[PDB]
């Protein structure tokens, strides 16, 4: 009831979620650069 | 006491981070399966 106070994991959760999203992007980007997900089709 | 766990942020952040890693790994695995099926389906 004192607003400005304690820990609200909501910000940190978004930070973790945002960071986690970035992690996934790096793995996808790295594999794409290997052409592993890239194939020559007709 | 004031913090039985208190910074559940560590636990939650770890849990949040862990859950995402599992999702990231799982999605990657599915993509692999799709290529494997297409690569396997050659014949």
Swiss-Prot record, chain A:
TM helices/strands, residue ranges: 7-32
Motif (GFFKR motif): 35-39
Name of the protein in its database record: Integrin alpha-IIb light chain, form 2
Source organism of this protein record: Homo sapiens
Lineage: Eukaryota, Metazoa, Chordata, Craniata, Vertebrata
Residues of the full protein shown: 989 to 1029 of 1039
Curated annotation (Swiss-Prot), chain B:
Highest taxon above the source species: Eukaryota
Subcellular location: Cell membrane; Cell projection, Lamellipodium membrane; Cell junction, Focal adhesion; Postsynaptic cell membrane
Tissues showing expression: Isoform beta-3A and isoform beta-3C are widely expressed. Isoform beta-3A is specifically expressed in osteoblast cells; isoform beta-3C is specifically expressed in prostate and testis.
PTMs per UniProt: Phosphorylated on tyrosine residues in response to thrombin-induced platelet aggregation. Probably involved in outside-in signaling.
Written domain comment of the UniProt record: The VWFA domain (or beta I domain) contains three cation-binding sites: the ligand-associated metal ion-binding site (LIMBS or SyMBS), the metal ion-dependent adhesion site (MIDAS), and the adjacent MIDAS site (ADMIDAS). This domain is also part of the ligand-binding site.
Function (record text): Integrin alpha-V/beta-3 (ITGAV:ITGB3) is a receptor for cytotactin, fibronectin, laminin, matrix metalloproteinase-2, osteopontin, osteomodulin, prothrombin, thrombospondin, vitronectin and von Willebrand factor. Integrin alpha-IIb/beta-3 (ITGA2B:ITGB3) is a receptor for fibronectin, fibrinogen, plasminogen, prothrombin, thrombospondin and vitronectin. Integrins alpha-IIb/beta-3 and alpha-V/beta-3 recognize the sequence R-G-D in a wide array of ligands. Integrin alpha-IIb/beta-3 recognizes the sequence H-H-L-G-G-G-A-K-Q-A-G-D-V in fibrinogen gamma chain.
Illness association: Glanzmann thrombasthenia 2: A form of Glanzmann thrombasthenia, a disorder characterized by failure of platelet aggregation, absent or diminished clot retraction, and mucocutaneous bleeding of mild-to-moderate severity. Glanzmann thrombasthenia has been classified into clinical types I and II. In type I, platelets show absence of glycoprotein IIb-IIIa complexes at their surface and lack fibrinogen and clot retraction capability. Bleeding disorder, platelet-type, 24: An autosomal dominant disorder of platelet production characterized by congenital macrothrombocytopenia and platelet anisocytosis. Affected individuals may have no or only mildly increased bleeding tendency.
Name of protein: Integrin beta-3
Species in which this protein is naturally found: Homo sapiens (Human)
Gene from which the chain derives: ITGB3
Segment of the intact protein contained: 711 to 753 of 788
């Amino acid at each position: 009831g004192a607003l400005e106070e304690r820990a609200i994991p909501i910000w940190w959760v978004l930070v973790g979620v945002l960071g986690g999203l970035l992690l996934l992007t790096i793995l996808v980007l790295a594999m794409w650069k290997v052409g592993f997900f890239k194939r020559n089709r007709p | 006491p004031e913090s039985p766990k208190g910074p559940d942020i560590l636990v939650v952040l770890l849990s949040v981070m862990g859950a995402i890693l599992l999702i990231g790994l799982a999605a990657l695995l599915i993509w692999k399966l799709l290529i494997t099926i297409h690569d396997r389906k050659e014949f």
